[PDB]
Amino acid sequence: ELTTRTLPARKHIALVAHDHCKQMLINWVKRHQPLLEQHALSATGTTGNLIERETGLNVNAMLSGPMGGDQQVGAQISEGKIDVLIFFWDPLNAVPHDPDVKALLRLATVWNIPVATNLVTADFIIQSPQFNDPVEILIPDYQ
Amino acid sequence: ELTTRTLPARKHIALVAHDHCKQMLINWVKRHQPLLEQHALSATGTTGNLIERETGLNVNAMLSGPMGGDQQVGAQISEGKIDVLIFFWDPLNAVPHDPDVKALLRLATVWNIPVATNLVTADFIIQSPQFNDPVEILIPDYQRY
Amino acid sequence: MELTTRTLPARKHIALVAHDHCKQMLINWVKRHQPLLEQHALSATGTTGNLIERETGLNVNAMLSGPMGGDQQVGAQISEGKIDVLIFFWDPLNAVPHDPDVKALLRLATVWNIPVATNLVTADFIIQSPQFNDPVEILIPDYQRYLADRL
Numbered sequence: 001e002l003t004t005r006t007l008p009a010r011k012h013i014a015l016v017a018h019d020h021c022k023q024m025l026i027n028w029v030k031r032h033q034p035l036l037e038q039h040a041l042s043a044t045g046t047t048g049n050l051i052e053r054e055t056g057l058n059v060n061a062m063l064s065g066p067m068g069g070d071q072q073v074g075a076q077i078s079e080g081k082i083d084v085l086i087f088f089w090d091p092l093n094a095v096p097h098d099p100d101v102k103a104l105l106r107l108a109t110v111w112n113i114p115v116a117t118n119l120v121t122a123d124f125i126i127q128s129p130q131f132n133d134p135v136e137i138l139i140p141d142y143q
Numbered sequence: 144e145l146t147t148r149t150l151p152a153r154k155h156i157a158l159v160a161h162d163h164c165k166q167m168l169i170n171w172v173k174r175h176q177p178l179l180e181q182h183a184l185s186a187t188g189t190t191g192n193l194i195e196r197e198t199g200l201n202v203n204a205m206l207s208g209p210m211g212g213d214q215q216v217g218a219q220i221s222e223g224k225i226d227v228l229i230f231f232w233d234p235l236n237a238v239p240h241d242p243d244v245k246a247l248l249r250l251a252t253v254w255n256i257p258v259a260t261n262l263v264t265a266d267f268i269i270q271s272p273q274f275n276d277p278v279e280i281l282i283p284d285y286q287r288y
Numbered sequence: 289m290e291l292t293t294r295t296l297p298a299r300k301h302i303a304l305v306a307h308d309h310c311k312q313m314l315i316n317w318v319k320r321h322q323p324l325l326e327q328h329a330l331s332a333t334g335t336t337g338n339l340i341e342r343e344t345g346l347n348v349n350a351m352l353s354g355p356m357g358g359d360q361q362v363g364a365q366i367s368e369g370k371i372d373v374l375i376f377f378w379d380p381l382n383a384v385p386h387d388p389d390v391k392a393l394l395r396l397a398t399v400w401n402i403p404v405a406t407n408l409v410t411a412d413f414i415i416q417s418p419q420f421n422d423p424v425e426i427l428i429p430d431y432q433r434y435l436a437d438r439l
Contacts, residue, residue: 007409020289046288067285068221068250071214078211091395092289099249102242102391105406107211109380112407117398120426124403124414137409140381142210209381239383 007113007135011083014073015043015051015059016104018090022047025088026054028119032126033057042082044069070100074107085115086122112137146284150256152277154226157216158186158194159208159247161233167262168231169193175269176200182275185225187212213243217250226278228258229265255280290433296372296402296424303362303371304332304340305354305393307379314377315339317408321415322346331371333358359389363396374404375411401426 013036017025029036029051037057042048045064052059063069076082085108089101108115116122125131156179160168172179172194184202186194191202206212219225228251232244251258257278259265268274302325306314314336318325322344332340334353340346352358365371374397378390397404403424405411414420 063221063285067253067283068217071217071221071246071250074211074214075218078206078214089398091398097246097249099242099245103214103240103246106240106242106380107214109378109406110210112409114409114413115406116410117394117404118401120401120403120424121405121410121414124417124419125410127419128413128417130413130416135409140210142206237383239379239381241383 001141002138003141004136005080005139007083007137009132009134010039011131012040012042012076012081013084013086014076014082015041015047015086016065016070016073017044017047017088018065018093018095020093021088021090022050024119025086026050028086028088028122029057030055035126035131042073044073065095065100066097068100070097070104074104077104077107077111077113083113084125085113086125087115087117088119089117110140112139144284144287145281146286147279148223148282150226150278150280152275153182154274155183155185155224156227156229157219157225158184158190158202158229159213159216160190160231161208161236161238163236164231164233165190165193168229169197171229171231171262171265172198172200178269178274182227185216187216208238208243209240211243213240213247217247220247220250220254220256223254226256227268228256229268230258230260231262231265232260253283255282290430291427292430293425294369294428296426298421298423299328300372300420301329301331301365301370302373302375303365304330304336304348304375305359305362306333306336306377307354307382307384309382310377310379311336311339313408314375315343317375317411318344318346324415324420327421331362333362354384354389355386357389359386359393363393366393366396366400366402369400372402373414374402376404376406378406399429401428 033055042060042062044062048059048061051057062072114125116125176198185205186202187205188207191204194200194202205215257268259268331349331351333351337348337350340348351361403414405414
């Protein structure tokens, strides 16, 4: 049983990267600075401060993955508060919070928000002529 | 890299049960009603409405586990807003949100709050004379790095 | 890990993969986007190909169902650079016995950096993009240099 929810024109974007993937995330943000500047940005750990020092964008801070930030992101997705997830997780290194990694991606699938796990997916999303449009999405009907 | 934090005398307790374990959790609540009435209670899914109908205890409702309730609980644990976790998960059925289940237990371990994963451990915790007093707990010093 | 590039052709090879309770969701999506999908190469796993041929006029390569090896067929072709796009509606509310195949397929789509969608909103962003029917240059691991370092 489905219902609908409205993703707004101006979006709340979560930016999450594993250690060997933080330089890949910062290069992506740099290439799309004017596209990100009017949306709201959040990031786990110190990635936000790295983005801030290199580009000037404001990024709200959350806990690092190992300390709980992935669950912070996931809780907000399910409350309808985060609209997009860019999650450059590391497929070539084992992390102790892998349960948190898979739980967060599970919820981004359940709640049907645009979610990219690599560069080319993130390009298709952020460069799309619809990224700045409101979006009506099908979601589970919790009641 | 450890520091300290104080759990208040009035604890914010999270009550979480999988489907076939719901009955055991409500029996535990009914056995310990006079103790639990002095604490703040939250529960995932409909479990809060079950408790309130059978005891009159006040229970703040959160999303069910499959829809993200375990991660709401984990987020508050890491923020220092939940002080105790009673998690009656089911060891004899497989659930689709198993990563969420293990992720909540990992964080409760990281942030070193009292946590019960079965009936006898829950009785030991809530029956402790220390349970309704302030409790100093060791925690990771995140404000370091 | 050093990077190189490869180019996904204008006509894409798209893998269409869905768990039992998500099959109807995938066919809804295929139905809406049929005028675009007729211009690309399509493969699907298990009974999903029957469903698509029956309900549309699209032609699909049959691959094995997920539990019998189909996810590893798709993964193999991804790593060989033969599959360009992955539409993978897996079920986050039901446990499956081939969950390791499911996670290994998503792991490889991440290493080899191909467009991948796990839900409707992400699938629409990809297929509707004005770039979808043009060559796409993507950054990929440099396998020969990676091998050279392991010796």
